[PDB]
Design a protein around this ligand. Structure first.
Ligand SMILES: CNc1nc(-c2ccc3c(c2)CCN3C(=O)c2ccccc2OCc2ccc(Cl)cc2)cs1
Ligand SMILES: Nc1ncnc2c1ncn2[C@@H]1O[C@H](COP(=O)(O)OP(=O)(O)NP(=O)(O)O)[C@@H](O)[C@H]1O
Ligand SMILES: [Ca+2]
Ligand SMILES: [Mn+2]
Length: 262
């Protein structure tokens, strides 16, 4: 029985917590138009500058237009008062990929191959939009498994973005202009985590140690533990220091490893 409702009446909320984050709580809900169960997410209240809420309002209109089989569906968003912002997405039945990896040690390469191809197809959708969407937070916790066939979808786009010149600019300003290639780097880290069932840069104690590492040529210790050389070679071409030397997503999907269907 419902404890909350959308203004249009389409979406119902049930008081059954299915996920928990530090600034967001995920409840089970229902789409009464399609009679499918949905995910009802309550996010912590945020500042209401007039220009910001017109931006959120219009960014959510774009998000609910993004229909693709390897992206978690965004249905609606509106403001409410449980004490906040309410978000309704597609319900992922089999949890996150990190949950699968936390349960087993050696993923089989048919699954490595199938699940990564879907992640790439989903990233390729985002990067060919107008303007393109850069996810910026691709990780195994933001990748979900759902349905009877075990379909793989990318979710949680909360940190994504769209798309004179200063004379005396500091080096951080010059390298600050990044592009979709940061998602290729992140994909390579996810594939590394799938092929090793180890967290990359586990040995480190902070993110400061992590940066100085990639820069001198020290890849995660888990990289030199990758069994299949074809997978290893895909990973290094994904996490290359210089972005202009990396795979594009299209070349990844043209790779012999992903052209196989097994
Ligand atoms: C597509 N499918 C899926 N989308 C999500 C998803 C999307 C948004 C949000 C969350 C999850 C949780 C946090 N969040 C928002 O605060 C937020 C809410 C509404 C509008 C913008 C927001 O953020 C700013 C922003 C700006 C540009 C882009 Cl491109 C994206 C987001 C899950 S499945
Ligand atoms: N659409 C969804 N469908 C099903 N479960 C979801 C969905 N979104 C989130 N969850 C659950 O919520 C958890 C994910 O955590 P999340 O909502 O990202 O909070 P968070 O910890 O603040 N963000 P992060 O630490 O970056 O993962 C998992 O246990 C998921 O099962
Ligand atoms: Ca550690
Ligand atoms: Mn998340």
């Amino acid at each position: 029985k419902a404890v909350g409702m959308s203004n249009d009446g389409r979406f119902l909320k049930f008081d059954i917590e299915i996920g928990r984050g530090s600034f967001k709580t995920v409840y089970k809900g229902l789409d009464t138009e399609t009679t499918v169960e949905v995910a009802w997410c309550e996010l912590q209240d945020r500042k209401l500058t007039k220009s910001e809420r017109q931006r959120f309002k219009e960014e959510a209109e774009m998000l609910k237009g993004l229909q693709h089989p390897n992206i978690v569906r965004f249905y609606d968003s509106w403001e409410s008062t449980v004490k906040c912002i309410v978000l309704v997405t597609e319900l992922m039945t089999s949890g996150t990929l990190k949950t699968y990896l936390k349960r087993f040690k050696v993923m089989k390469i048919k699954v490595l191959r199938s699940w990564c191809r879907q992640i790439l197809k989903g990233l390729q959708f985002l990067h060919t939009r107008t303007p393109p969407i850069i996810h910026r937070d691709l990780k195994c916790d933001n990748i979900f498994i759902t349905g009877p066939t075990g379909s793989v979808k990318i979710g949680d786009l909360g940190l994504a973005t769209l798309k004179g010149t200063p004379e005396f600019m500091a080096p951080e300003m010059y390298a600050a202009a990044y592009d979709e290639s940061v998602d290729v780097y992140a994909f390579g880290m996810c594939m590394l985590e799938m092929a090793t069932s180890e967290y990359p840069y586990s040995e480190c104690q902070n993110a400061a140690q992590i940066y100085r590492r990639v820069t001198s040529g020290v890849k995660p210790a888990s990289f030199d533990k990758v069994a299949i050389p074809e997978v290893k070679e895909i990973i290094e071409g994904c996490i290359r220091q210089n972005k202009d030397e990396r795979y594009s997503i299209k070349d990844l999907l043209n790779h012999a490893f992903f052209q196989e269907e097994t």
